[PDB]
RNA sequence: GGCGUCUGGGGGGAACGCGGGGAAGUGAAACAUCUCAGUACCCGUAGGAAGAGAAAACAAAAUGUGAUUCCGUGAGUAGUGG
RNA sequence: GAGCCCGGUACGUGAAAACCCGACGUCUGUCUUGAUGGUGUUCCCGAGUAGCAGCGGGCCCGUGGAAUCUGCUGUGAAUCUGCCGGGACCACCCGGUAAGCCUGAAUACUUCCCAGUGACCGAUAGCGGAUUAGUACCGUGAGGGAAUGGUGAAAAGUACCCCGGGAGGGGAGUGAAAGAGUACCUGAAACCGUGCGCUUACAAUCCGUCAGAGCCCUCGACGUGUCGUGGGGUGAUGGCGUGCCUUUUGAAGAAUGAGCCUGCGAGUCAGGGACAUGUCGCGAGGUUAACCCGGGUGGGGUAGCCGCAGCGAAAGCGAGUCUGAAUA
């Protein structure tokens, strides 16, 4: 029985072309270029999903450092004091507190200062 | 050992036929019957499909143009498979699909199908389909309706029972087979099996002897 | 068409009761003067086909 | 009631055919042939060995001839006679043929591998010494055609 | 040799038959013996079929078969072969 | 999408004439001037033939110890106690009777005609050829050789008016539908437009991906706009980011290939083949080939084949056997 290849190819062509909407130039019209761009786009998405956590952590660290320096304390000393004090709030909510509730961040800075050792450079 | 009581077109029981255990009480084998009917259908199919290969298409006996200087792809003939109108690479060719199933397998499959039919008492025996010397499809249809209410039935009558064969010929769900031509596919395709007394006796004598 | 068996392989190899392939050792045709009797004695008789050549010799024989 | 659509093959009795050159998923772009070479295009003959003298040509031919006039015997052991003739009696060639001890239209020779404990008269083409002693020991006779 | 008078032939056809002539690419990892292959093709001829056909035959001591032809085994065997 | 509307089907019927098969005849030849079983002797039984020699062909046999058959060249016999064959050759036995001719059936095939069939194709397929097809066209010539199917149930194929030179179109009609108008079933992609929403003229962009302000649209709730387990479109801006394939030690490329789209284009089949592995039947047995009978897929068919004993070059012996002086 002779079989025509229309439907089987048209299915995947429709899916690939629909997935490539919004692209510029040939990448949104022609199936081959759209498929190449789909490969690249999905690889980029997979890599960026992994890198997004680090990107957001870097942004939170920047905001926390800015807020802490506004309270006359460095980010690293503040983190060490917070770890010593036992407060387990992560950097995401720390940055949220810094942006939204400066009083809570000031209180946390105070408790971190309290928890820090007397001479940070001592061999202890 | 199963008993089948003979029914007559007049509507009264005539006698009884004793079905031997080795012919109507064997355990059906699904795989064996499947293989047998598959071989049967393969033997039925005729392989009258053919296509012209690269060597049987008309023309193409010359190299088309210059291999070099043209700047185009090199071609050896205008009948190459990639060419429109060219030959077929691996196309259908005439062939035979029949299989050499052993005799014992076929006999066992037929016995299993018959025993499965007999277990649910789908086997019926009659003297004659209709009153003799004149076909009458109405009488045959009425008798078959009295015998069973199923859709597909199988009628096994001798090659000399012309009146019955002509009478039950035109019914939509009736298939007519000869006692020596019984096979797994025809038995399994039918809900009920209607045996002529002489046909049933001939089958038993031929097999159990 | 039925397959054709090899001629030289059929003339060179044998089979025992349990299907083992058996060959004859070479270096026993001529130039037999300088060869000590022990060397020819160890070259006498028949040996089983080494497992490396078993597949090839079986394919040739069948 | 088994119908035509209730028929299925035995479990694992059918296997899917492997179609090669159908994309990188199963077997793509090479069909299990590796990169280029002689084997990548057509084949390599069995008798070929790369130009080195093949094993089928550097070995001496098996010694001897075939003796077209050779007479061959289908053999039957006395143990088979004992197992197949518990009551004993007359044992001819076509008794063995009926019992399926020898082929139907061949010469028959009786050997003495097994144990014979039943008085039996055997008529064959040839007898081994041990077979004759075993047959005569149990009171039977060993005549030959 | 000429003259006259009668009866035949001539060419066409897709396949199949018989009798002749008869390659090379190819394989042998080269190549000449060999293979391809008595194939491709060519020549002369028929018939509805053709050819063969009635033992100067096989066989092996069986008191054996009994024209030819065709199919299946024998058998990829006995053998043959740089 | 019809068994009961039509053509038909099952089933019966029909040949003036021609031809083909038979049968009975006229007709032809032919035996009867014949037939049987017996007895001892001379003649005949296919001649430039058989045989031999030289050179070749073909036989499993490639000249080999090379038999049988056959072509050319020389030589060249016998008529039955004769001759030929039984794989060099000799003897004995066995078989047959060359150098003369005819022979039906079993067998091979389809230019053509008839009736059917298809787990064959359905307009880049199937014949090269569903349409002017071996046509158009190409070549002096042998020769090569295409492309083009579908309105609608019915043409009812748009009367009439208007713009226009016409083409084409807008009304009006026919039609179930004119998103069926003889450019006509369905009408995809490439490619080219028109309208709307967002964005873009300080910007170094494998053209995407992750965050993401703003604008527009939309689904709910509460008021008059503001959030939400919302969804969409476009996206200023920041981070990251060297097309695909082949061949490669190694190529984002400055090693190769691709202008794009839609169709087509590559591990297939045959053989009781060979090996391995599933699965089924039977099981020390299994199994038939050709062929015969069944309108079928069924029944028969023991010829063979594989198992059933091996060892030895072989004679041969045999649960043993070979080598060997040896139980060595």
UniProtKB/Swiss-Prot annotation, chain A:
Instruction: State a single Pfam family of this protein.
Output: Ribosomal_L20
Q: Which GO terms describe its biological process?
A: ribosomal large subunit assembly; translation
One MF term in GO for this entry? rRNA binding
* GO CC terms of this entry: ribonucleoprotein complex; ribosome
| Transmembrane residue ranges | none
- Entry keyword Ribonucleoprotein: yes
Q: Which domain of life is it from?
A: Bacteria
Keyword list (alphabetical) reads: Ribonucleoprotein, Ribosomal protein, RNA-binding, rRNA-binding
Q: Which family does it belong to?
A: Belongs to the bacterial ribosomal protein bL20 family.
Name the job this protein performs. Answer: Binds directly to 23S ribosomal RNA and is necessary for the in vitro assembly process of the 50S ribosomal subunit. It is not involved in the protein synthesizing functions of that subunit.
Listed name of the protein: Large ribosomal subunit protein bL20
Report the source organism. Answer: Mycolicibacterium smegmatis (strain ATCC 700084 / mc(2)155)
Q: Which gene encodes it?
A: rplT
Swiss-Prot record, chain B:
What InterPro entries has UniProt attached to this entry? Ribosomal_uL4, Ribosomal_uL4-like, Ribosomal_uL4_dom_sf
Instruction: Give the domain of life.
Output: Bacteria
Give me the disulphide-bonded residues.
Answer: none
Specify where the region named Disordered lies, as residue ranges: 42-99
GO annotation terms (biological process): translation
Q: Name one Pfam family in it.
A: Ribosomal_L4
Q: Which UniProt keywords apply?
A: Ribonucleoprotein, Ribosomal protein, RNA-binding, rRNA-binding
A cellular component term (GO) from this record? Answer: ribosome
In its keyword annotation, does this UniProt entry include Ribonucleoprotein?
yes
* GO molecular-function terms, A-Z: rRNA binding; structural constituent of ribosome
Is Membrane given among the entry's keywords? Answer: no
Q: Which family does it belong to?
A: Belongs to the universal ribosomal protein uL4 family.
**Reported function:** One of the primary rRNA binding proteins, this protein initially binds near the 5'-end of the 23S rRNA. It is important during the early stages of 50S assembly. It makes multiple contacts with different domains of the 23S rRNA in the assembled 50S subunit and ribosome.
Q: What HAMAP family does its record include?
A: Ribosomal_uL4_B
Q: How is this protein organized at the quaternary level?
A: Part of the 50S ribosomal subunit.
For this entry, the protein name equals Large ribosomal subunit protein uL4
This protein's species is Mycolicibacterium smegmatis (strain ATCC 700084 / mc(2)155) (Mycobacterium smegmatis)
Curated annotation (Swiss-Prot), chain C:
**What GO molecular function terms would the record report?**
structural constituent of ribosome
Q: Name one GO cellular component term.
A: cytosolic large ribosomal subunit
Does the keyword section mention Ribosomal protein?
yes
Q: Which keywords accompany this UniProt record?
A: Ribonucleoprotein, Ribosomal protein
Q: Where is the composition biased (Basic residues)?
A: 1-41
One GO BP annotation is: translation
Annotated spans, Disordered:
1-62
Composition bias of kind Polar residues appears in 47-57
What is an example of a Pfam family matching this protein? Answer: Ribosomal_L35p
Question: What Gene3D superfamilies does the record tag this protein with?
Answer: 4.10.410.60
Keyword Secreted tagged: no
Concerning HAMAP family, the annotation shows: Ribosomal_bL35 (MF_00514)
UniProt record similarity statement:
Belongs to the bacterial ribosomal protein bL35 family.
* UniProt cross-references to NCBIfam families, sorted A to Z: rpmI_bact (TIGR00001)
PANTHER family registered for this protein in UniProt: 54S RIBOSOMAL PROTEIN BL35M, LARGE RIBOSOMAL SUBUNIT PROTEIN BL35M
The protein in question is named: Large ribosomal subunit protein bL35
